[PDB]
Structure formats: structure tokens, C-alpha cells
Amino acid sequence: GRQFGHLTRVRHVITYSLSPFEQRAFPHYFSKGIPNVLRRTRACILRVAPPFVAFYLVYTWGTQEFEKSKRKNPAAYEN
Amino acid sequence: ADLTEYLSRHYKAPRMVLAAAGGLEHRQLLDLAQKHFSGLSGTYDEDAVPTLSPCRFTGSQICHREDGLPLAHVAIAVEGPGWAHPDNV
């Protein structure tokens, strides 16, 4: 186990903070909120999204061919 | 110029108090005060209104971390009432 006071060494940093009863819990919730989640979404679409559409494409084509394999089967049997 | 202007701004009679304690007699003090201090507010200012605006208090916290010091100092306080409030006692 590790306690405060024995964690690590810190040089010259000041930290100002404020009482919760003195500030808002939702500063600019929407004003600053939305823009940021856009920003984080943007920042990550390209690594998260691609594999999922790949699965998405393989899922719809996969069931497609499953029905068209049997149902479509006949087809032609002419004599 | 910054100085002299603060001087004239603030070193005005109604804000000064000649005080003394010991082997004196009050009359002698008054005489002196009237002899060496007469003529300080021979000019009561037009619109210089040295009034103290009340000061907001803030439940807040400042931490100056420095693990190079051998011992820590902490100071915690709550808002007090001020000089004149009987609550002081």
C-alpha cells in the first residue's frame, strides 16, 4: 500500500483551487461542452469507426448471401 | 510622483492620531500638537473620498508545494467579523 506523504518528490508548483460552494457545478455546460465532444469525436473517429463499418459491411452482405443461397437456390431446374 | 500623491492623498489630519504614554500631561501634548501640527487639513479635499469598499472573502485554497523545505506551514482561516464586532471577545 502507498500513502500520501510517501508518494513522490515535487519541486516548485503552486495549485490554486476553489470551494465547491463558491463555484458552479456546470460552468458552461453546453457552451463549452458540445464543441469539446465534437473535438474528441473528431480526434478519434478514424481509429474507432473503420473496423466497425467493416464489420457492418460484412454483416449485411453475409446474411444477404445466406438467404440468396437457399431461397434463391431454385433458381433454375429445367427439364 | 507616485509617492507624494499617495502621501497627500492619505496623510490628512482626520486620519491621523497623535498618541503618547508616560510622564506627560495632556495639556502639554495638546499645545505641541497645535503648535507643530496646525495646518494639515487647512484644505478639506473636494472629491477625494478615501472610503474602504468591503472585501469579498473566498472559501479557497493555495498550495505551494516544495519538497525541498524540511517542514510545512499551513494556515487555515474562516471569515472573521472585523475590528468593531462585539463577537471578538
From Swiss-Prot, chain A:
Modified residues (N6-acetyllysine): 32
GO biological process: cerebellar Purkinje cell layer development; hippocampus development; hypothalamus development; midbrain development; mitochondrial electron transport, ubiquinol to cytochrome c; pons development; pyramidal neuron development; subthalamus development
Listed InterPro entries: Cyt_bc1_su8 (IPR004205), Cyt_bc1_su8_sf (IPR036642)
Residues on Mitochondrial intermembrane side: 68-79
Chain ranges on the Mitochondrial matrix side, renumbered to this chain: 1-38
Keyword line: Acetylation, Electron transport, Membrane, Mitochondrion, Mitochondrion inner membrane, Respiratory chain, Transmembrane, Transmembrane helix, Transport
Membrane topology (UniProt): Single-pass membrane protein
Pfam families (UniProt xref): UcrQ (PF02939)
Subcellular location(s) of the protein: Mitochondrion inner membrane
N6-succinyllysine: modified positions: 32
Gene Ontology terms: cellular component: mitochondrial inner membrane; respiratory chain complex III
TM region positions: 39-67
Oligomer and partners: Component of the ubiquinol-cytochrome c oxidoreductase (cytochrome b-c1 complex, complex III, CIII), a multisubunit enzyme composed of 11 subunits. The complex is composed of 3 respiratory subunits cytochrome b, cytochrome c1 and Rieske protein UQCRFS1, 2 core protein subunits UQCRC1/QCR1 and UQCRC2/QCR2, and 6 low-molecular weight protein subunits UQCRH/QCR6, UQCRB/QCR7, UQCRQ/QCR8, UQCR10/QCR9, UQCR11/QCR10 and subunit 9, the cleavage product of Rieske protein UQCRFS1.
Function of the molecule: Component of the ubiquinol-cytochrome c oxidoreductase, a multisubunit transmembrane complex that is part of the mitochondrial electron transport chain which drives oxidative phosphorylation.
Similarity comment: Belongs to the UQCRQ/QCR8 family.
Record protein name field: Cytochrome b-c1 complex subunit 8
Organism, as annotated: Bos taurus
Protein's gene: UQCRQ
UniProtKB/Swiss-Prot annotation, chain B:
Lineage: Eukaryota, Metazoa, Chordata, Craniata, Vertebrata
Function: Component of the ubiquinol-cytochrome c oxidoreductase, a multisubunit transmembrane complex that is part of the mitochondrial electron transport chain which drives oxidative phosphorylation.
Organism of provenance: Bos taurus
Coiled-coil stretches: none
Subcellular location: Mitochondrion inner membrane
Subunit structure: Component of the ubiquinol-cytochrome c oxidoreductase (cytochrome b-c1 complex, complex III, CIII), a multisubunit enzyme composed of 11 subunits. The complex is composed of 3 respiratory subunits cytochrome b, cytochrome c1 and Rieske protein UQCRFS1, 2 core protein subunits UQCRC1/QCR1 and UQCRC2/QCR2, and 6 low-molecular weight protein subunits UQCRH/QCR6, UQCRB/QCR7, UQCRQ/QCR8, UQCR10/QCR9, UQCR11/QCR10 and subunit 9, the cleavage product of Rieske protein UQCRFS1.
Similarity annotation: Belongs to the peptidase M16 family. UQCRC1/QCR1 subfamily.
Name of the protein: Cytochrome b-c1 complex subunit 1, mitochondrial
Residues with the N6-acetyllysine modification: 35
